[PDB]
Ligand binder design. Structure first.
Ligand SMILES: [Zn+2]
Lengths: 534, 225
């Protein structure tokens, strides 16, 4: 059931109790965890925090901790499955679920005692009515009703997508409690920007949520500040920006930013040998010297920078890149620390999905979670360096795929596969980084190919995962049209193929459109996918 | 005109406020006055130098950093004089034998990507440049005068504490005797001579910087600077 008021029916309940946070491995989950940690630390709520990277380790952690905790909070996990069946809880536990995944499972919706959904009722939700889903001529009509149930429930469960950011939900809770600090607002901004960077939401919804956050930014910017009374440089200042879509461009050279941003790399076709001359034509049209463009942005001459954003937009419009600007936010504090929300997103994401083998994925979660606090600015800057490396590896992998023509149109969907031992495959073995790679590669492919047919197809990408057990990670991506609503069917198409072929499919990641598959079964799995999508 | 001196005074004040106010850290952890602390400790150690980061200066006041890049010779001496002021007000009072304030050498470093020796073209003359290389030769350390005084041979008219411009530039002694009337003799053609006991000198060295081996174009010998 949906929690109507977060303050009354969730926070004031768990405020008196020991609580267990299960937190998923993504930047929005991390930001929601930071906000909720801050509230609990204000109120001396003795919580325990456990990272979980998948369903099986969530089940393991719950089996470990179910004896000692009666109140659980799941951040960016649980809403899209039957948690009662998955975890098999005791009759009197409570699971609060703050999760962006949609559609919410009908058992989660209509469970009225144990599952409590911290989900805004005004999200994109169309739940079927209870009587349509739950309980001679009489039994004939019973069977007819069951057939109608199967039809309706397939129509409900078909398309998976994402709702409002969990960080924004927790910030609204903090605002209702009136314990909303400026760093909490920054964490909310970073969660929404994580959704936008990973393309989990439409541009319309992102602009609407930015419009929501602008008012909170104005309120915080007038708590103790106006045009004639101003604070120390120590204090944090969040500012609304109509900034550039380039990635990390204030922390490395504008050349590296243009080369390693997905949009401009795809448009200029910089994987190709000819694309560098297109980029040089763009820079010459702007009138920026190449030495300045290749110099680091902080060391670039200041006479080039104070109208650079509108210069970029003006040149991009006549080059056909009609939307180089983006509505975003920045944070300043001290004399020299300045970050865009995209910069913090990429740094934290890289700290999570780092290619380092030392430690473990939970240690990398811990590094990412530490980097979001300003007591660990060294960790944030290290994450920025790792993000530069990750972006470069992404472009090299895209270039390899397109140059070798690994992307082949398998009728209903394009298909690509990474190969074991090839460069950076270990970096992209992790499902989140693989999803980002597949999205960037699909944009690059759509800009590359001249066929009108290929510009509309979705894409399925495979990569090696295991040799001790011999498996691969497979992801499904929707088409990259500007008309797209950012919903995909691959979460259900994969399991329909898997059950049609009786394939050894394992379903550990929280997104249904990412799976693990035995390397032998991929042939018949793909055959079933072509047969299914038709 | 003296409006130039007014500009110099305000720019020296701004450099002084950079060295007085710059901090590193966060309010969650704590702050340290980086350049005040370095000035204090180096002066007490008897070092009398600091190294300033161009990015720190640019974050504090980007106009000062731009001025140092475009016109380093003009503005570095203002920065060094401001460093001397901050050293005085950071170390005062001092024990006996340390009453006389010392000059501070301000060094520069930056995070910017460097240029090559073959990037140095006539457009960049007198600008601040950053280049890599290998030291292949180094001369003996020798004395360069920073302040001199010159006395006239006829009337013993003296000019005191003439500022010597830094670098390999020298100084032109006045062609004719200064500030007094054209008497008899008017002037022998070099009226002035440098007084031996009043010169203040600093160490200087000459080195040869060779181009890095991997920066050389194919077929060419490495250049020297
Ligand atoms: Zn004379």
């Amino acid at each position: 059931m949906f929690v109507s008021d977060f303050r009354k029916e969730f926070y004031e309940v768990v405020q008196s109790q020991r609580v267990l946070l299960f937190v998923a491995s993504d930047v929005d989950a991390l930001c929601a965890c930071k906000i909720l940690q801050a509230l609990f630390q204000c109120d001396h709520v003795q919580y325990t925090l456990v990272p979980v990277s998948g369903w099986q380790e969530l089940e393991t952690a719950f089996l470990e901790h179910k004896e000692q905790f009666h109140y659980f909070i799941l951040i960016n996990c649980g809403a899209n499955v039957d948690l009662l069946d998955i975890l098999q809880p005791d009759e009197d536990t409570i699971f609060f679920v703050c999760d962006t995944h949609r559609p919410v499972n009908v058992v989660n919706v209509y469970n009225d005692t144990q599952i409590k959904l911290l989900i805004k009722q005004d999200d994109d939700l169309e739940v079927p009515a209870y009587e349509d889903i739950f309980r001679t001529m009489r039994r004939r009509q019973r069977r007819e009703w069951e057939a109608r149930r199967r039809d309706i429930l397939f129509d409900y469960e078909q398309y998976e997508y994402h709702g409002t950011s969990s960080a924004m939900v927790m910030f609204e809770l903090a605002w209702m409690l009136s314990k909303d600090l400026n760093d909490m607002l920054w964490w909310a901004i970073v969660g929404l920007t994580d959704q936008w960077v990973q393309d989990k939401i439409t541009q319309m919804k992102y602009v609407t949520d930015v419009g929501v956050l602008q008012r909170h930014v104005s309120r915080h910017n007038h708590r103790n500040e106006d045009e004639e009374n101003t604070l120390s440089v120590d204090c944090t200042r969040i500012s609304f920006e109509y900034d550039l879509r380039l990635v990390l461009y204030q922390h490395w050279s504008l050349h590296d930013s243009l080369c390693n941003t997905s949009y401009t790399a795809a448009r200029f076709k910089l994987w190709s040998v000819h694309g560098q001359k297109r980029l040089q034509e763009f820079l010459a049209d702007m009138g920026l010297p190449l030495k300045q463009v290749k110099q680091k942005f902080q060391a670039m001459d200041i006479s080039l920078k104070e109208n650079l954003r509108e210069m970029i937009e003006e040149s991009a419009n006549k080059f056909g890149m009609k939307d180089m600007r983006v509505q975003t936010f920045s944070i300043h504090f001290g004399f020299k620390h300045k970050f865009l929300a995209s910069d913090v997103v990429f740094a934290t994401m890289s700290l999570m999905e780092s290619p380092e083998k030392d430690g473990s994925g939970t240690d990398h979660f811990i590094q990412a979670l530490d980097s979001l606090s300003r007591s660990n600015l060294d960790k944030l800057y290290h994450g920025l360096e790792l993000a530069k490396k990750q972006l470069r590896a992404t472009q090299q992998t895209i270039a390899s795929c397109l140059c070798t023509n690994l992307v082949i149109s398998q009728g209903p969907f394009l298909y690509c596969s990474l190969m074991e031992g090839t460069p950076d495959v270990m970096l992209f073995s992790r499902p989140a980084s693989l999803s980002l790679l597949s999205k960037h590669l699909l944009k690059s492919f759509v800009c590359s190919t001249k066929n009108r047919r290929c510009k509309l197809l979705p894409l399925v990408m495979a990569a090696p995962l295991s040799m001790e057990h011999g498996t691969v990670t497979v992801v499904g991506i929707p088409p990259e049209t500007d008309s797209s609503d950012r919903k995909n069917f691959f979460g259900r198409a994969f399991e329909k193929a898997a059950e049609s072929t009786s394939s050894r499919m394992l379903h550990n990641h929280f997104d249904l459109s990412v799976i693990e598959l035995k390397a032998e079964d991929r042939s018949k799995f793909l055959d079933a996918l072509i047969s299914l999508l038709s | 005109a003296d409006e130039g001196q007014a500009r110099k005074s305000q720019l020296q004040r701004r450099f002084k406020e950079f060295l007085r106010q710059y901090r590193v850290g966060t309010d969650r952890t704590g702050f340290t006055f980086k350049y005040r602390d370095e000035l204090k400790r180096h002066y007490n150690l008897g070092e009398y130098w600091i190294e300033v980061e161009m990015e720190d200066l640019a974050s504090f006041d980007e106009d000062l950093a731009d001025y140092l890049y475009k016109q380093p010779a003009e503005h570095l001496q203002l920065l060094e004089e401001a460093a001397k002021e901050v050293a005085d007000e950071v170390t005062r009072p001092r024990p006996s034998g340390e009453e006389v304030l010392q000059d501070i050498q301000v060094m520069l470093k930056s995070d910017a990507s460097p240029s090559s020796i073959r990037s140095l073209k006539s457009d960049m003359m007198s600008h601040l440049v950053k280049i890599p290389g290998i030291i292949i030769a180094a001369s003996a350390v020798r004395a360069k005068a920073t302040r001199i005084s010159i006395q006239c041979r006829s009337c013993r008219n003296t000019l005191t504490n003439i500022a010597m411009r830094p670098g390999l530039e020298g100084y032109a002694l006045p062609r004719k005797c200064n500030t007094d009337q054209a008497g008899r003799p008017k002037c022998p053609l070099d009226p002035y001579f440098i007084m031996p006991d009043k010169c203040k000198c600093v160490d200087f060295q000459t080195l040869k910087l060779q181009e890095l081996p991997d920066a050389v174009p194919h077929g060419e010998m490495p250049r020297h600077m």
